[PDB]
Design a protein around this motif. Structure first.
Motif, short mmCIF file in Angstrom:
data_model
loop_
_atom_site.label_atom_id
_atom_site.label_comp_id
_atom_site.label_asym_id
_atom_site.label_seq_id
_atom_site.Cartn_x
_atom_site.Cartn_y
_atom_site.Cartn_z
N UNK A 108 0.62 -1.24 0.10
CA UNK A 108 0.20 -0.02 -0.23
C UNK A 108 1.01 0.96 0.45
N UNK A 109 0.29 2.67 -0.73
CA UNK A 109 0.84 3.38 -0.44
C UNK A 109 1.12 4.57 1.28
N UNK A 136 4.75 1.95 1.42
CA UNK A 136 5.62 2.80 0.33
C UNK A 136 5.48 4.26 0.15
N UNK A 137 5.71 5.48 1.12
CA UNK A 137 5.68 6.34 1.41
C UNK A 137 6.82 6.76 2.69
N UNK A 138 7.09 5.36 3.43
CA UNK A 138 7.45 5.64 4.83
C UNK A 138 9.08 5.21 4.14
#
Length: 13
Positions: free
Chosen positions: A2-3, A6-8
């Motif tokens: 999940x985004x 994928x952001x961390x």
């Protein structure tokens, strides 16, 4: 996968 995870990897990294 999940985004939210994928952001961390970059944003938080």
């Amino acid at each position: 996968k999940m985004v939210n995870e994928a952001l961390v990897r970059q944003g938080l990294a």
